[PDB]
């Protein structure tokens, strides 16, 4: 039996949903449940984006599947520049080349590398210099898609190839929308009107009696699951707030990304959310129509670095976005620095709010007190001397960063806001929950913990215990039980 | 060494050039010189058109060559209907008064299928539709059974590009089109050959590449459809030996031998004579005019375009074997009979052929009250019975070409009276031997000579025996010896 985590693709910069999908995959292998990520969109760079995260045998892409290129890795590098000159006697006028036969302009080639071992695309031109066809190469080496052009470089149709160059899919477009898809599969021809129908066909070929699907990128996967039969079991996973407005729990419309899932609840064996708090809201909102279950989106990893070697160092691990209200922590430091002259705030993240935050810092002469540290891929060394974590957001989700900092014995002072802080913070155990936007009470609890390092030490010991509760193995056992119960009942 | 006779195609009704190519192949086969016909145009019916006349190994079509379908014969039949119904689970709906079926996956219209035969054994094409019932692609099947070409459509079913396949389904050629004067014109051709890709701007360049792939030292090419074949040979090296074959008059105006422009179909060959080893024409008379016109720059050789039951069992039966076209001037034959019937009341004239002039010919027949004297007999595939009682053949044309029809009537002992016009009458008529030649458009002299042969049956008999003797000069064995000597000589000089 196989567990499939259905997203869309993998960017250069992995997204929350992509990490969750990958994170969840690792856990299933650990406990000896087979699992695979399922990708939908055509992405001739997928194998590259995947390389530093999962193996080729750990994912099935829908286009790779019909192009017979699943589990296929990089071809041995190919000398395109040599083949064009030494075998085809063409003329190259320079990571782009213009290919001429004698005086005749044929093609526009585009490479990735300056070593020219990885071809990207080749534009083909007619006798009038009209661009008639584009050849799009997969990062693994084989020609993946040719696009036929008409009029003003308008896409008319696309042909997708297997590695050996057989046609496996055809797409036909009008204005640029798909009106027809042809697939060559199982020694015949299949016809679809759109990519959702193709996706549904793909899911039916994947499924074997006893497998389980997870719907992770609902804006794409729910419409696909909606056209598959009810004998194929699938669970919906929400990675965010389920409604546009969390303060109108009964009334708020579902997020657009979750609409097609919520409007066909009966198709799904369950909904998974990250927090008990979110499970209670969702359960009540859908009148218990299907099971809702809370399974955290990560775990506290075993500690490899020195812990609480304690200058008072406060930290923020948070995207530089409006919702994290990070200026409130700069203002906190403005207040505290008169009582705590050697105080330091380190804020780890990136995003829109950098310029404004940077300006607020210079404005208050806090350049020796508050540091916008940007993104660090490794935070282990940053936690060893951290006195406490701050959360000043108007909204949250289950925070992997918070779990990591707790596993390092760094206690946390957070607003009590949905979702995540209530799950990972017990007041006076591993930190303190504060009424949302009460900056005065924030100052009082931060000052109190700084004034009483015996308190910080005791909250440190609570932090290590809270992290122990969210271990890799507790999370394994929760996935293991859920999967067996969902399949048992199906 | 291989002799290659390069034409365009074979139609369902063979043209003059197609027959000339096939007759030449048959002579080379009898002789023991390897020959093949070479065809250029994409023609997914070529195999059926060819079956009555040549074997698969007797020809190489250009498209078949690149489609890895040269020498391929017919597939065992395939019941597309059962495969669509039983194996694909599609819904078939017959179209009223047709061999056509609409194909559906449930409520969804997917394809329109056309069969050649009401038994649905020969799939011809399949049209594909998108979700908005736009016709996006047409699949064209070869008569041998394989999918030959897919054509991709845009806008009002305009041809954008075409993909040509081997029998296994691999793409071997692509063609890209742009519209000019309301018709698609090739702007690009890609060919997958010898594990490489090759690029061309037009079919002339593709043709030249094809010739270069066939040629081995010792081989010899004949350019028979010069409007297409000459521009192709013009793009090939002079190391490849090619003979130009003219199948009609070489100039637009036969009466200005020196100054007339060449026929548009021969312009490319005459504007590059030094490319060609020789020119072949069907008549000694055309040979002398062409040699003079080109100042003997290359050799010109006349080789007839073809070779030659009970006989002369004799009512007085005149015959005309001639297209009903204005150049033939068949009205003059009506006028001749109008004048003759007075003196010869048991006279008949049988006119074998067809064309746009039939209506006027019937009007004149009716006008002259000649309905029991002049017969418009239509085309006749076989004329053997029609010859046995024929007294005399008539030719009243203002222009001619070498006539296999006239050769055949001469083999059957039928003498002829013809206007003296170029080309063909002087080749097959020696005055007072097998017939008479009359000043062009001299209807009085035509009457007088026709009347003299009717009034002298012993003269008719001598001319008949001269017709048998004239035809025997065009024997299979004399054509073989001309062709054998020509190829020997051409290859020695090259």
Author numbering:
A (entry chain C): 0 to 93, 98 to 178, 183 to 317, 321 to 500
B (entry chain A): 0 to 307, 312 to 317, 321 to 500
From the paper:
This study reports the crystal structures of SdgB and SdgA from S. aureus as well as multiple structures of SdgB in complex with its substrates (for example UDP, N-acetylglucosamine or SDR peptides), products (glycosylated SDR peptides) or phosphate ions. In addition to the dimerization role, the inserted domain was found to serve as a binding platform for the SD repeats before and after glycosylation. Altogether, the extensive snapshots of SdgB complexes in multiple states provided a mechanistic insight into how SdgB recognizes and glycosylates the clustered serine residues in the SDR proteins.
Two glycosyltransferases (GTases), SdgB and SdgA, are responsible for the glycosylation of S. aureus SDR proteins such as ClfA and ClfB. SdgB first appends N-acetyl­glucosamine (GlcNAc) moieties onto serine residues (O-glycosylation) within the SDR domain using uridine diphos­phate N-acetylglucosamine (UDP-GlcNAc) as a donor substrate.
